[PDB]
Amino acid sequence: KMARAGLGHEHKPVGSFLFAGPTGVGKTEVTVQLSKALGIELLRFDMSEYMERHTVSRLIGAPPGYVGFDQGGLLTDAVIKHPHAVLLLDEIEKAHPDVFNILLQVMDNGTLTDNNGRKADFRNVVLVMTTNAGVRETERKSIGLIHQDNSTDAMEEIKKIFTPEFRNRLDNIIWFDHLSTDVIHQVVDKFIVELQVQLDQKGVSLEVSQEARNWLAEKGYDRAMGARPMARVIQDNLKKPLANELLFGSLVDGGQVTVALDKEKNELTYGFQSA
Amino acid sequence: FIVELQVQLDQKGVSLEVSQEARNWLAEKGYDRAMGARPMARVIQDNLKKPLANELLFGSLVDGGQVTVALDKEKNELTYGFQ
Amino acid sequence: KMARAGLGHEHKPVGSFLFAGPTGVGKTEVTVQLSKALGIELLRFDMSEYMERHTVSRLIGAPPGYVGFDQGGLLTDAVIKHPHAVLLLDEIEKA
Amino acid sequence: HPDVFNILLQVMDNGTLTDNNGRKADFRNVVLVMTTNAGVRETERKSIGLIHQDNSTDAMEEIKKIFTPEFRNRLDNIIWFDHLSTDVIHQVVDK
Amino acid sequence: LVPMVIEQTSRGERSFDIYSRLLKERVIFLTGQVEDHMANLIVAQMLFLEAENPEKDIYLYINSPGGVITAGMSIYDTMQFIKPDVSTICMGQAASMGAFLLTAGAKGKRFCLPNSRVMIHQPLGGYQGQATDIEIHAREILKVKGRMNELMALHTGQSLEQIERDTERDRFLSAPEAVEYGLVDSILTHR
Amino acid sequence: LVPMVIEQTSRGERSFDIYSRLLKERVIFLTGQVEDHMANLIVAQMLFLEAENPEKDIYLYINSPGGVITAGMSIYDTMQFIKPDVSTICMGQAASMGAFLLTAGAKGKRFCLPNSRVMIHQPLGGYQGQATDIEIHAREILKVKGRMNELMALHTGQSLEQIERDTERDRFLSAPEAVEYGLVDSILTHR
Amino acid sequence: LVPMVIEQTSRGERSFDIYSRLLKERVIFLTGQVEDHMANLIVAQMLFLEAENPEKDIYLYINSPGGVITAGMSIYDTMQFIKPDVSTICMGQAASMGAFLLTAGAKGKRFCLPNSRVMIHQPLGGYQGQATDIEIHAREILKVKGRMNELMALHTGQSLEQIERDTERDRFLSAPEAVEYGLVDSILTH
Amino acid sequence: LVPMVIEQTSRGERSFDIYSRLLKERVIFLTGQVEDHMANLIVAQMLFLEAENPEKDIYLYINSPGGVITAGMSIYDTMQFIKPDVSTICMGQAASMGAFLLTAGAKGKRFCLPNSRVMIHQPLGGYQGQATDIEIHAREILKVKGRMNELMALHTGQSLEQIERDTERDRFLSAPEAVEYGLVDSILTHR
Ligand SMILES: Nc1ncnc2c1ncn2[C@@H]1O[C@H](COP(=O)(O)OP(=O)(O)OP(O)(O)=S)[C@@H](O)[C@H]1O
C-alpha cells in the first residue's frame, strides 16, 4: 500500500515480505494469487540449489556457458525481462552467508550491477522470502526422562539464522499462521473434485463418503510437512485401485464407483460396479 | 529530517507541521550513543511515513491536503491529525 | 582547493583521508554530501564483503586461464568507467 | 551437467522439444526413464562394538542434493532398489 | 571425565559435554551431599535457564544421599522466585534435603521412580561452646526444624503435627508409599 | 591418559576420545565401583542416546566390582524406562549390583564373555545408633533385600524361594552356568 | 566440573562457563569461606563490570559461611568505590563477614530470600605469644570491632550501641526479622 | 576457577581470563604470601607492561599477609628499575612485606583504602645449627633488618632511628594513620 501512495523514496523497492513455518504454507498460493491480482509475472528462484560455488555464482553469473554473454546474471536478468515481476525466494537458510549479503545490498540501494555491466532496478519488484526453521526444532524431542514440547517462536529463529542488519532493513517480520484441520478437509475435497472433473470426461462417476475424506485427512496431512503429503496420499490411494479396473474390469464401461471405509478394520473398501 | 519529509509531501501537495516538542521526543528515541544517528532514519520512516501514506491514497489527505503531528504525554506515543 | 590550484600531488590521488569516529556521526555522509555538491559520481565498495583472501581477486580480476579472467576487476572497471569520482571505502578495518 | 535437467524439465512439462530445425517431437508416446548411482553410497563399515548394529542411510539424501527440487517434484516416483537377498540370489544362479 | 556429545545445528557441528548438552535442554542433575559449592552450581544453572527461556520449564533430578541444611535451602529459595516450574524427578535415592527439594517441585511436575527410596529425617546439627551461646543456638536451630515442617506441610498438605510426628525419627518410604503421602506423583511410564 | 581417535567424517575430521567415539555407537562402559557420581554419567549417556535414535538399541559393557545399591537402582530404573533395548555384556567380573544390571537388560540381548565370572550376594549394610533407629534402619535393609529378589527373579525366572537361599551367601557362577541360571541368554565365544 | 553454556551473537557462538555467562549479565556469585584469593576474584569481577557499563547495576549472590575479616574488607571498599549499585542477594547462610557484605550493598536494592538466614557475630581470633604481643593484637581486633560495628550501623542505620550489644553475642535473624533491623530493604516476593 | 571475559576488537571477539583482561589495562594483582614463584610472576608482568607502554603507569594491588623477604626484594628491585611509575594500592591488609612493597611505590601515586590495615614489623627469619653457623646467619639477618629499615625510611621519609623504634615490635597501623606516617600519599575516596 505504501508504494501505491508514492510517499516513499523512488529507489526503495515496492515491498518487502517474509514467510515462516512448514513447507507448503501457501507460499505458492498467496504469491501466485498476489501476482495475478497485481498483473505481474510470477518469477520464482529457489535458494535450495544455491549451496555450492558454481551454483551460488548463478545469481550474477552465467552457469549455462562462459562463452554466453547475453544471459549474464540469471536472477538479475529475470528482473530485466519483467520489471514488475515478483521475486519468490525459498529455503534461504540453506544458502551461504556470503550470498545473503548481496541481498542486503539491493535492499538498501534498490539497484544491482551485473558482472557484464548491466544495471537492474529493484524499485518495481517486491521481494518475498520463505523460511522453514520451525519444523526442524519442533520435531526434535527434549533430552529428558520426560519429554517436553520443543516448539519455538518463529521470530526467534529468524533472528539467529539471519544477521541483525537484515531485520533492520526489512520493514517487518511476517509469520504465517499454521494450517488448520478444516482447511485440510477442504483441500481433500478439492483434490477429489479435481479427480472428479477428470473422470467425468471419460464418463466415470466417483462418489466419496464424508467419512472417507476425514480418514485420509488424519494420516495424510502432517504438521511438519503441512499439506504436501496429503496431496501425494490422495493420488496413490485413489488413482491406483481404479487404474487397474479402468484398463480391464468392471470400470471399463459405465464407470460406477463408490468409496467407503470399514470401521472394524480401519481400511478403505472400494466397490466396483460394471454398470 | 522533518524538512525532507515536508519537502517530499509538498511535491505531493500535502503540508505537514510538526510540534517542536515532538521533534525533541523523536531525537531521543531515534538517536543512540553507540549507533549515533543511524536509527533516526528508520524511526522517521516507520513512525511518520507509513501512517501518512495510508491517508494519502485514501482519507483526509487526498481530500484537503493537510496533516499534523502531535505527541501524547500519557501514552508517550506520537499522534497524527489528518485533515 | 590545492588540487585545482595546481599544488596537488602529481601522481598520488587528490586526497587520502581516514575518518576514525563513532558510527553514525556523519563520516559516511560527508562523502555522499560532497559528491552531490561537486556533481561527480560516487564509487562505494563494501569492504565487509571483502573479508577473505579470495575476495581481493574480485577487485583486480582473476589471472589468465581462469574462470574470472573474462570478468574485469570491480575496482578497475569502476574507476576506468568513472575517472573523476569520489571513492568511498566503509569498514576498511574489517578488510 | 545440470543444463540437461532443464531440457528434461521442459520435455516433461511441455511434452515437446524444438531443435535447430524447429521440428516438434512427440514425447507423450515415449516413456522417459533414468538411472542414477547416488544410492550406491552406503555405510559398509560396521559399528564399533562387540555386537554389530545395522545402519540405515538417510532416504534420498544424495538424490535430493544432487538434483534440483522443482525437477525432482515433477518426477512421478523416485523408485528405489533394495539389496538382493540371499534367497533371491539363488534364483539368479539358475538364470 | 565426561564424554563429548555432538549436536547438529544449521550453522554447523558443535561439541558439548554430556552434562552441558543436558543443561541445554533445561536438565539439571543433583548428585552427592548438598553443599555450598555444589548448590551454587545448581543455582547458577537455574538462573541461566530462566534468562534463556522463562516460558519453558526446568527439570531437577535428585540422587543425593543427604546434605547441608543451609545449602539445600538455597536451591529451594531459587525455585520460588524463578518463573519456570522446577520439575523434581527423583532418581535412585532421596534424603532430608533431597526429599525437601523433591517435594518442593511444582505440583504435577514432581515425580519419582519405582525403586527410588525417599528418606525423611529431622535436621541434625552439633555445636559446642559457652552455655549462653549453646542456649541461643539451640532455640534457633530448633526453629529451622519447625520451619521445615511448615514448608513441608504446604507441599505435602498434611498438618504440621502429622509431619512432625512422622519426621521425629528417621522414616523410609517406598515409591508407592511416597506418592500416597503427597511427596511425589507417579510417572506416566508410557511410550 | 585416554587416547584420542579420529573419525573420518565427510564434512571434516572430528577428534574424539576412545570412550566418546564408542559412545557415538551407543556403547557405554560401566567400569569401576558403583557410585552416585558414576551412575549419573550412565543415566546421562542413556538419555542422550535414546533422544538421538530411540529405534536403535543401546549396549552396556559391565566390568564393575559392585558398589552402593542405591546408585545402581538409578541405572536399573532408567534401563527399562528408555525405549532402546539396553543390551548388557558382562566383561571380566559381575558383582551383586553388576549382576543385577546384567539381568536388567532386554531379554534376548544379554550376553557374557566365555571366561567372564559372575557373583551374586545379598546387599551388605550396617547402621549405628539408638536401638529404635537401628530397627527402622535394619527393616529397610530387609525390605530392600526382598525387592532385589523380586526384580532379579522376574528377569532371571528363578523362583523366589530359591533366590533367597542362593542369595544368602556369595555364589560364583561361571559364564556357562550363568546361561543355565538365566542371567544371560548366551555367550559370545567368537564372532 | 562446571557446565559450559553457549552464547548467541551475530558473529557466532561463543562457549562460556555457567559462572562466566552470568557475569555477562552483571551477576556475581559469592560462595565458600572468604579468602584472599577468593576476595580478589570478586574484586576483579566488580571492577570489570564497572568499566563495561557504569550505568547498569551489578548483582551479588552471597552464601558465605564467614572467613578472614581483612579479605572481606577489600570487597566492601571495592563495592563502595564502584559507581554501579550492588544488589546484594542473600541466597544462603550469611555469617558476620557475609552479612556485612549484604549490609554494605547499596540502599534501596538490598534483598534477602524468604527462607535464607543471616547470622551476625563479633570478629573472633586467637593469638599466642608474649604478653606484650597479645596486647598489641588485642588492640587491633578491638579497634576493628568498633570499625565493623560503626560501618554496619551506618549502612543499617541502627544505633551503634544497640548493634554492638547484638554483635557481641552470637545471634541468628530470619529474613522477615532482618527487614526490621534494616540489614535488607525487603524480601523477594517472587 | 577464574571466569572468562570477552573484549571486542575490530577483527573479532577475544577471550581472556579475568586476571589477563585486567593485566591488559596495566593492573597487576598481588595476593597471598610472597614467594619466589608468585614474585617471578609479578616481575614478569611488570617487564611485559614496560615494553608495551613505558609512559603509562603500572597498578599493583597488594593484598598479601606477608612472605619471605628474599622474594620481595626481587619485586622491589624490579619496581624501582622499571621506568614506569608503579602505583601500589593496599587492598584489605598489608603486612611487613606488603607494606614495604606498598611504600616502594613512586611518590605521588601511593594509596590505601579507608578500611585497609597496614602492619610493619622486623624480619622473623631464624636459623638453627652449630654456634658458628648461627653466628654467621645471625649477622646476615641484622643486615636485612637494617637494609629494610633504611629502605622504608627513604620512601616513608622518617629517620632511621624512628623506623627502628616502630619495628622493634609489631605495630598495627590504620589506613588514615598511614597518610600521617607517610607510607601512602593519600587515601582513595569513593564516588
Ligand atoms: N551532523 C549531522 N547532521 C545531520 N545528519 C547527521 C549528522 N551526523 C550524522 N547524521 C545522520 O546520521 C545518519 C547516519 O550517518 P552516517 O555517517 O551515514 O552513518 P552510517 O552508519 O553509514 O548510517 P546508515 O547508512 O544510516 S546505517 C544519517 O541520517 C546522517 O545524515
Numbering used by the authors:
A (entry chain F): 475 to 749
B (entry chain E): 665 to 747
C (entry chain E): 475 to 569
D (entry chain A): 570 to 664
E (entry chain M), F (entry chain L), H (entry chain H): 2 to 192
G (entry chain N): 2 to 191
Original paper wording:
ClpAP, a two-ring AAA+ protease, degrades N-end-rule proteins bound by the ClpS adaptor. AAA+ proteases, such as ClpAP, consist of a hexameric AAA+ unfoldase (for example, ClpA6) and a self-compartmentalized peptidase (for example, ClpP14). Each ClpA subunit has two AAA+ modules, called D1 and D2, that associate in the hexamer to form two stacked rings. Here we present high-resolution cryo-EM structures of Escherichia coli ClpAPS complexes, showing how ClpA pore loops interact with the ClpS N-terminal extension (NTE), which is normally intrinsically disordered.
Following single-particle cryo-EM analyses, three-dimensional (3D) classification and reconstruction using RELION-3 yielded six density maps (3.22–3.38 Å), representing three general structural classes (I, II and III), with the latter classes being subdivided into IIa/IIb/IIc or IIIa/IIIb subclasses. In two classes, the NTE is bound by a spiral of pore-1 and pore-2 loops in a manner similar to substrate-polypeptide binding by many AAA+ unfoldases. For example, density for the ClpS NTE was present in both the ClpA D1 and D2 rings in classes I and II, but only in the D1 ring of class III. In classes I and II, residues 2–15 of the ClpS NTE were built into density in the D2 portion of the channel, but this NTE region was not visible in class III, presumably as a consequence of its conformational heterogeneity. The register of this ClpS peptide is very similar in each structure, with the C-terminal portion of the NTE (Pro24–Pro25–Ser26) near the top of the ClpA channel, and the N-terminal portion near the bottom of the channel in classes I and II. In classes II and III, the relative height of ClpA subunits was A (highest) > B > C > D > E > F (lowest), whereas in class-I, subunit B was higher than subunit A, resulting in a shallower spiral when aligned to the bottom of the IGL loop and the two flanking ClpP subunits. Previous ClpAP structures and subclasses IIa and IIb show four or five engaged GYVG loops.
